[PDB]
Design a protein around this motif. Structure first.
Motif, PDB file in Angstrom:
ATOM      1  N   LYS A  41      -7.172  41.567   3.503  1.00 38.64           N
ATOM      2  CA  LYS A  41      -8.338  41.712   4.232  1.00 38.64           C
ATOM      3  C   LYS A  41      -8.069  40.536   5.358  1.00 38.64           C
ATOM      4  O   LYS A  41      -8.175  40.899   6.780  1.00 38.64           O
ATOM      5  N   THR A  42      -7.840  39.134   4.876  1.00 41.28           N
ATOM      6  CA  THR A  42      -7.508  38.103   5.772  1.00 41.28           C
ATOM      7  C   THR A  42      -6.439  38.730   6.956  1.00 41.28           C
ATOM      8  O   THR A  42      -6.603  38.353   8.040  1.00 41.28           O
ATOM      9  N   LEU A  43      -5.461  39.002   6.417  1.00 38.12           N
ATOM     10  CA  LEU A  43      -4.111  39.186   7.198  1.00 38.12           C
ATOM     11  C   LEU A  43      -4.264  40.135   8.217  1.00 38.12           C
ATOM     12  O   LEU A  43      -3.522  40.214   9.030  1.00 38.12           O
ATOM     13  N   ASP A  44      -4.766  41.382   7.902  1.00 33.44           N
ATOM     14  CA  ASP A  44      -5.049  42.345   8.791  1.00 33.44           C
ATOM     15  C   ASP A  44      -6.420  42.303   9.646  1.00 33.44           C
ATOM     16  O   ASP A  44      -6.341  42.829  10.633  1.00 33.44           O
ATOM     17  N   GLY A  45      -7.451  41.281   9.297  1.00 35.17           N
ATOM     18  CA  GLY A  45      -8.515  41.134   9.761  1.00 35.17           C
ATOM     19  C   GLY A  45      -8.572  40.160  11.072  1.00 35.17           C
ATOM     20  O   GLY A  45      -9.147  40.814  12.257  1.00 35.17           O
ATOM     21  N   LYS A  46      -7.812  39.025  10.826  1.00 35.44           N
ATOM     22  CA  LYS A  46      -7.933  38.192  11.882  1.00 35.44           C
ATOM     23  C   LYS A  46      -6.682  37.327  12.190  1.00 35.44           C
ATOM     24  O   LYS A  46      -5.678  37.753  11.735  1.00 35.44           O
ATOM     25  N   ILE A  47      -6.510  36.662  13.180  1.00 39.78           N
ATOM     26  CA  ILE A  47      -5.258  35.895  13.606  1.00 39.78           C
ATOM     27  C   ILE A  47      -5.498  34.350  13.134  1.00 39.78           C
ATOM     28  O   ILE A  47      -6.228  33.611  13.843  1.00 39.78           O
ATOM     29  N   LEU A  48      -4.772  33.914  12.120  1.00 42.43           N
ATOM     30  CA  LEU A  48      -4.680  32.641  11.857  1.00 42.43           C
ATOM     31  C   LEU A  48      -3.869  31.885  12.711  1.00 42.43           C
ATOM     32  O   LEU A  48      -2.943  32.424  13.346  1.00 42.43           O
ATOM     33  N   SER A  49      -3.860  30.523  12.674  1.00 44.00           N
ATOM     34  CA  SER A  49      -3.031  29.625  13.624  1.00 44.00           C
ATOM     35  C   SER A  49      -1.438  29.458  12.857  1.00 44.00           C
ATOM     36  O   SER A  49      -1.521  29.847  11.760  1.00 44.00           O
ATOM     37  N   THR A  50      -0.720  29.172  13.655  1.00 39.57           N
ATOM     38  CA  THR A  50       0.654  28.881  13.095  1.00 39.57           C
ATOM     39  C   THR A  50       0.684  28.022  12.088  1.00 39.57           C
ATOM     40  O   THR A  50       1.021  28.330  10.986  1.00 39.57           O
ATOM     41  N   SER A  51      -0.064  26.758  12.287  1.00 42.21           N
ATOM     42  CA  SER A  51       0.034  25.715  11.057  1.00 42.21           C
ATOM     43  C   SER A  51      -0.740  26.350   9.979  1.00 42.21           C
ATOM     44  O   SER A  51      -0.192  25.981   8.763  1.00 42.21           O
TER      45      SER A  51
END
Length: 248
Positions: A41-51
């Motif tokens: 869900k997380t990985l397809d849903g939004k954009i995390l920072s590189t960090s």
């Protein structure tokens, strides 16, 4: 622990890396089916920072290749941190190897190791900070040789990795040449690779045969700076070998 820069404009490329993490997470037997759902869900849903991706995913799950890809996307350049990550990659590979002295086990390991570096290199070779060939080549040589039976290591096993990863024969040649003449040690290993490289170049590239003869190639059994056919040709016709030649 490690702080990488993130830019909003790189979101689509970051999304690509999250897809790659997602794929690993999907097959990761160490992770709980319920957690997987959430991570997906997380990985397809939004954009995390590189960090975030580095410190919350790549590090904790030991996805070393991902770490390197994040470095690339983040324009991280610190040499020590980078080679240290490469080191973790190699050591985790060592951990899964079954050393029986069986020729097949050696082959399989050599194969899987090659595939791993080929895949990562295809993605990062266009970066001299993430894929520092001058430094990685000797490392792969040492690694093979610390790990496998000498008698199981075929000439070309190392250099072909880089060629297949997408490094030009030209670049690989100049780098290996500088490795060879810049070392006060044996070089026997560098030499067999270079021998393999040149023979591979010949039978692969008519534009390279058009410069040096079938006879001027069958002689080279073990490379030497003076045996160097490319050297000879250049001492006669100039150092213009034409545009970069890659493996097909």
């Amino acid at each position: 622990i490690v702080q990488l820069a993130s830019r909003i404009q790189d979101a689509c490329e970051v999304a690509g890396i999250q897809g790659d993490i997602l794929s690993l997470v999907y097959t990761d037997a160490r992770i709980d089916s319920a957690i997987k759902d959430e991570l997906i869900k997380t990985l397809d849903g939004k954009i995390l920072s590189t960090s975030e991706l580095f410190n919350d995913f790549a590090v904790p799950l030991s996805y070393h290749e991902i770490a390197l890809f994040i470095f690339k996307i983040a324009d991280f350049r610190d040499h020590e941190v980078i080679m240290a990550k490469w080191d973790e990659l190699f050591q985790s590979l060592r951990m899964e190897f079954n050393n029986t002295g069986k020729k097949e086990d050696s082959m399989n390991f050599i194969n899987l190791l090659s595939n791993v570096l080929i895949k990562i290199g295809k993605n990062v070779q266009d970066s001299e900070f993430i894929f520092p060939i001058f430094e990685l080549f000797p490392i792969v040589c040492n690694f093979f040789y610390e790990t496998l039976p000498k008698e199981h290591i075929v000439s070309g096993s190392i250099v072909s990795i880089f060629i297949t990863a997408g490094v030009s024969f030209n670049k690989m040649y100049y780098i290996l040449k500088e490795l060879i003449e810049t070392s006060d040690s044996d070089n026997s290993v560098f030499n067999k690779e270079m021998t393999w490289l040149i023979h591979e170049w010949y039978k692969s590239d008519r534009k390279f045969r058009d410069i040096i003869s079938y006879n001027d190639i069958i002689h080279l059994k073990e490379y030497k700076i003076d045996n160097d056919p490319i050297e000879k040709y250049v001492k006669n016709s100039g150092n213009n070998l034409g545009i970069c030649f890659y493996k097909e």
